[PDB]
Amino acid sequence: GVQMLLTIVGAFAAFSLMTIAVGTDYWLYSRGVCKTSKKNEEVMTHSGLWRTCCLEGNFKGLCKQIDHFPDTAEYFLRAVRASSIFPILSVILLFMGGLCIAASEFYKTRHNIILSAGIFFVSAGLSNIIGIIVYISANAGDNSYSYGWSFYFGALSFIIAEMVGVLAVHMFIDRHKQLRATA
Amino acid sequence: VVLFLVSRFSPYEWHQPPNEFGIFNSLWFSLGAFMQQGCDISPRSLSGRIVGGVWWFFTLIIISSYTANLAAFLTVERMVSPIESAEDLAKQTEIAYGTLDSGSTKEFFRRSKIAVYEKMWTYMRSAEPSVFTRTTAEGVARVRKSKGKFAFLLESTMNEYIEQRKPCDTMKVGGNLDSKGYG
Amino acid sequence: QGCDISPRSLSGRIVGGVWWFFTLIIISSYTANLAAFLTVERMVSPIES
Amino acid sequence: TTAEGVARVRKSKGKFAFLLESTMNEYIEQRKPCDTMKVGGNLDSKGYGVATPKGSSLRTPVNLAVLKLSEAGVLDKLKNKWWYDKGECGSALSLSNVAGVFYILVGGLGLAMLVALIEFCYKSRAEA
């Protein structure tokens, strides 16, 4: 159907844009040292979630590993922006939602698989918001910082995930209305 | 999306929609709610009420934090000071100030027993980077380029001349500190 | 305050929404400016020269 | 001791400031963890001298040595050696302010979906 084609495309799109977001290293555009004896560094660097690579300087494309642990209670944040479980939990959920949609087009009659997808997309978009907030709220703790296309993919992925969630619920409603009609 | 879902996904409620909270009527309740502007529809289930109760609290804090920060800006700006006398200069540190080297103005401050001018000298002589300039032109440039963070002590004749030169961005303030002449 | 009618069409709901946003910014800018007027009393504007 | 004053500044979360000579202040400003700063102008102007007991015959020679070292540039070289050559140190609201409201919100949206999917499970298992 038309409502299904969009769901497949939307599930794929959301999952693709979030996987690229979690992997690419252009989340933030800030000023920082792209290398592990005073060093005249402070060169323009682009950072993702785990790697920071400077945009310019004698180290044109040298990368590094972010050090996320540089006293209590707050720590819990430093450890949620260091595993990045919320961005990664959002990838897993979107993948699981796709399985549901795909499984739906095979078994059929089940109806509750189509719903499950709806719960795995809406929650995926909800994990994403928490990951976005945690990201921003951690950098602030530590300027002309600007955001890159990996941030705006994770923002665009959220939008596509919520819309597929609406669409998947709208298909679940329609499946059940067809049952009530025959009754 | 979550309001839409929690309300209409369950077919046990349908008999005809049980609530009017379709995705569209949910994007409208949530909008109205945020703008404090009340609406006509209101959730009637336990689920749909945990989505309007945490959104009314969110809305409340965000609107209160906009009014209370717009009222902090408008106030602090209302406390701005013109800084137009030597006494004003002497009582603050945000705006640097200095004199020409190797002339009578610098000597005036160095020798003054007047408290305000002694205070000014004590600051100027140890300020870093140097607040002294080698030529009047350099002092003018420093005023013009420093975004209000440098003021220049110079003879009224030179001051009045520069006040009538483009780009007409400087001004003499306060009375003269002494009375003398060129010979 | 509240009324007894809320637009139920897309066209009508855009007008209602851009006007509830306008309203919000202006009622906040009045309370916030009024607060600045009562917190810091300047009250100085006679002969100056 | 000066070290105790430095520690008190460093450990007191901004609630202690230490009055000390500019020389010591400037030295510490270039030591790790680079968390202190000299502020303001100096309150007075003075110097350190080499001291001898009153009337000691050593005083004259020591004084001339200080002047010779000064004039040869050696005192400046020593200060740079020990202070600088060896130095170790080289508004709107933000989401941080309202992080909580956002969490609470996403926690009541996940609590609503739990209180709604649970009821759904019951009503469905009951119809069996």
Ligand SMILES: CCCCCCCC/C=C/CCCCCCCC(=O)OC[C@H](O)CO
């Ligand atoms: C049909 C049910 C849904 C109805 C929906 C009705 C929508 C009405 C819009 C409301 C607020 C609009 C706010 C617009 C804010 C614009 C911000 C802007 O222009 O910002 C420029 C720039 O990015 C700054 O840095």
Ligand SMILES: CCCCCCCC/C=C\CCCCCCCC(=O)OC[C@H](O)CO
């Ligand atoms: C009929 C059903 C009606 C609707 C029912 C749901 C509405 C919930 C509304 C507000 C929640 C506010 C939660 C506030 C959380 C405060 C957290 C707290 O206690 O923080 C302590 C602090 O961290 C120490 O330092």
Ligand SMILES: *C(=O)CCCCCCCCCCCCCCC
């Ligand atoms: C029947 O027993 C099914 C309901 C029980 C499982 C519910 C699982 C979903 C819970 C709500 C969604 C939480 C999203 C959190 C996002 C960070």
